[PDB]
Amino acid sequence: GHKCGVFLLNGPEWRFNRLRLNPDVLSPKAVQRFLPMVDAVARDFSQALKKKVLQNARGSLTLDVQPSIFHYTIEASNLALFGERLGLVGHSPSSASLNFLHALEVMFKSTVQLMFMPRSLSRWISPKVWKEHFEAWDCIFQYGDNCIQKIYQELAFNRPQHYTGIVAELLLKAELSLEAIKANSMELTAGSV
Amino acid sequence: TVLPFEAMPQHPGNRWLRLLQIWREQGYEHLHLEMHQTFQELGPIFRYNLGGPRMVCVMLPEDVEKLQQVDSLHPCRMILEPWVAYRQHRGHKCGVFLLNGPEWRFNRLRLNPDVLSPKAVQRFLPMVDAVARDFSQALKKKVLQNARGSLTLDVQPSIFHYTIEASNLALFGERLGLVGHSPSSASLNFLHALEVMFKSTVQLMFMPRSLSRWISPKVWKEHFEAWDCIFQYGDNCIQKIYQELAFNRPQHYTGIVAELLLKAELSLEAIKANSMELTAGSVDTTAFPLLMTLFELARNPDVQQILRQESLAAAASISEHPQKATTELPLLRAALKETLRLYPVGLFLERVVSSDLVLQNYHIPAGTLVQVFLYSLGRNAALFPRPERYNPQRWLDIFHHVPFGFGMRQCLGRRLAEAEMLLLLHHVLKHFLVETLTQEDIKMVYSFILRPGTSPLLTFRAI
Numbered sequence A: 001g002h003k004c005g006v007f008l009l010n011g012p013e014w015r016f017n018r019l020r021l022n023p024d025v026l027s028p029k030a031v032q033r034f035l036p037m038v039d040a041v042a043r044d045f046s047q048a049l050k051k052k053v054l055q056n057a058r059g060s061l062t063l064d065v066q067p068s069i070f071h072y073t074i075e076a077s078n079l080a081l082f083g084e085r086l087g088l089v090g091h092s093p094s095s096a097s098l099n100f101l102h103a104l105e106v107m108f109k110s111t112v113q114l115m116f117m118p119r120s121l122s123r124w125i126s127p128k129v130w131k132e133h134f135e136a137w138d139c140i141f142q143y144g145d146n147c148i149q150k151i152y153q154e155l156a157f158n159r160p161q162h163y164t165g166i167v168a169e170l171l172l173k174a175e176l177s178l179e180a181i182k183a184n185s186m187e188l189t190a191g192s193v
Numbered sequence B: 001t002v003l004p005f006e007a008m009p010q011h012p013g014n015r016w017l018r019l020l021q022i023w024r025e026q027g028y029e030h031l032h033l034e035m036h037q038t039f040q041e042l043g044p045i046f047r048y049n050l051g052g053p054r055m056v057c058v059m060l061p062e063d064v065e066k067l068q069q070v071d072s073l074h075p076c077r078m079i080l081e082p083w084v085a086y087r088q089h090r091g092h093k094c095g096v097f098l099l100n101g102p103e104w105r106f107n108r109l110r111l112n113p114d115v116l117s118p119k120a121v122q123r124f125l126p127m128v129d130a131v132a133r134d135f136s137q138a139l140k141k142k143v144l145q146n147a148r149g150s151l152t153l154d155v156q157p158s159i160f161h162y163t164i165e166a167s168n169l170a171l172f173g174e175r176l177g178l179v180g181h182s183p184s185s186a187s188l189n190f191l192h193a194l195e196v197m198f199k200s201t202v203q204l205m206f207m208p209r210s211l212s213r214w215i216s217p218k219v220w221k222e223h224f225e226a227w228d229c230i231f232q233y234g235d236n237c238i239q240k241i242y243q244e245l246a247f248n249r250p251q252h253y254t255g256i257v258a259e260l261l262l263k264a265e266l267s268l269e270a271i272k273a274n275s276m277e278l279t280a281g282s283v284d285t286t287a288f289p290l291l292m293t294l295f296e297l298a299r300n301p302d303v304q305q306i307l308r309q310e311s312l313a314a315a316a317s318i319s320e321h322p323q324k325a326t327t328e329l330p331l332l333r334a335a336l337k338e339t340l341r342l343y344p345v346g347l348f349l350e351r352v353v354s355s356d357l358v359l360q361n362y363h364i365p366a367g368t369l370v371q372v373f374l375y376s377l378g379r380n381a382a383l384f385p386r387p388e389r390y391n392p393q394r395w396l397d398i399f400h401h402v403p404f405g406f407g408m409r410q411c412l413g414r415r416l417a418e419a420e421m422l423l424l425l426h427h428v429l430k431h432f433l434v435e436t437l438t439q440e441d442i443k444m445v446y447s448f449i450l451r452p453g454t455s456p457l458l459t460f461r462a463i
């Protein structure tokens, strides 16, 4: 019983959402405002990595960077989107953090499984996969909703005089209903990693 | 007219349908609401068909006062069979909470000076304060990393870890490193075992061992394994301090248990059993009232601002002398009084009376089980004008406050608990605004301790 974000909407519900999202998510004006926040996380990634590199006698580190890049993007997007700093860059992955990366990967896999066949057929051919897919989404929504309940309750009490992120702008303006904001916020959270 | 015992109203409950409903639901989560409505139905006293022995439930300061006048020299509570059973199974002695008689008194009197007495607070309160300052520093650093200078979280885990840490420093002189850091596994195992110990206690305390041993044997192994874990945790603390003192007896205060071991008035075995009571009893009993207060303060920001006012005024002197926080923050102490009136961790006081007495002008014979239900007591509109209101002034204007019990059996950890709560609040109040959207009543649940069924999302905004 959730609303669909701009990705899954067609027609005029889509256009209503989109025109109320371009200004704070996509415009050059919004980029001027979040780019410095993103820069901070990027700076931090490079410093954390350098500390490790300089501890080594050959002055290099040789690693699979994928994990730490994924945690960079989770951190960067969460700061840009919600104005919170998760503490994931330069430290170890949290367990919410890893569960979220896993849930996304399972959600993508199962997507392909279910994608190329009608619900009428996939229902009985691959019911265990519908279960997997929905479980992945429950975990994703769990993570995204934790984020939004935090920002919502923070913004009901004080309207900051300064920029504290993309979703903050949407909530301050309150041009979209709460449910619409929640739906679009989920797409940006899930889609930003 | 001193009316005879029988005149007293009777609970419509069948001893047997209660056992069966506990067996079935695996608990009695509504105990407090039931007793409350019964009091609304049948007045401020009633009796329970226990099948022979005499149970009476009261809820008036009047009645508690009389009750203190019939504490023998050896005030007596009813054997909690499941707890004692575990002790005797592993060959341990019983600490003060599970003793009656001569042996209770011998232990208690060798415990008051170092755990409860004013001279003990003065020594351990600075250590507690050190942990409370750390709690807020750790929180401020997290908060200031956020663009809006605030963090919104379920605070239950970090508040429980504060009580573990503060209690441990006070009790053993050790810093466990659980404030401003993650839970250890030993930490989570301990909290889990406490939770399960409590849950199973309810199951086994409401039917004789007679039946429970074969009706719910899985509940027994569950209870014992929880205690095994709790003892493992508490024994490790004891092994450490014991070894350290055997090689060096310090010249400065290093906590409550040290004082006990140094004096060696009690046997090691008796010291071991009382440390386990303090270690086990110092976590949830304190954590939950602390959470309820944060919640009430967040629903009542006007009251919060008044409490902040005075904590800022005293900020100065308290950081110079932490020991003065007891005296200098009397409005914050009133708030605790107010939290425990509405949300008493110990739901009911309990005495098996050694003499006959009179309550509400009914005759109460000796050997009678008398229970004071503090939940209903705290909500009496008569003694507490506007009972539903969270108003610490209520206390400044004035046996109305007995959530720690009374007499010589009253809570041994009272001053510790109150230090831990008072100091955390004080330091939080100087630095943060506390806020929630979730303004609706939190439903309490009874599993031996009476605790919030839900944990609301609290925002801490830096000032």
Ligand code: HEM
Binding pocket: B077, B096, B097, B098, B108, B277, B278, B279, B281, B282, B283, B285, B286, B289, B340, B344, B345, B346, B348, B349, B350, B403, B404, B405, B406, B407, B408, B409, B410, B411, B412, B413, B414, B416, B417
């Ligand atoms: C807000 C927190 C607490 C509350 C509301 C509370 C409440 C109580 C109550 C109602 C009793 C029964 C008193 C009576 O029968 O008259 C009691 C006894 C006791 N409490 Fe607490 N308590 C708290 C915290 C603690 C802590 C932290 C400790 C350990 C440090 C502790 C240790 C004990 C012990 C050992 C007894 C048994 C004393 C005896 O039977 O002589 N309590 N407490």
Ligand SMILES: C[C@]12CC[C@H]3[C@@H](CCC4=CC(=O)CC[C@@]43C)[C@@H]1CC[C@@H]2C(=O)CO
Binding pocket: B097, B276, B277, B278, B280, B281, B282, B285, B345, B346, B347, B348, B349, B350, B405, B448, B449
């Ligand atoms: C407060 C309490 C008595 C004291 C205990 C507490 C639960 C935790 C606990 C564990 C111990 O090993 C020592 C006593 C104690 C601190 C009980 C919960 C309900 C009970 C009462 O309601 C007393 O009337």
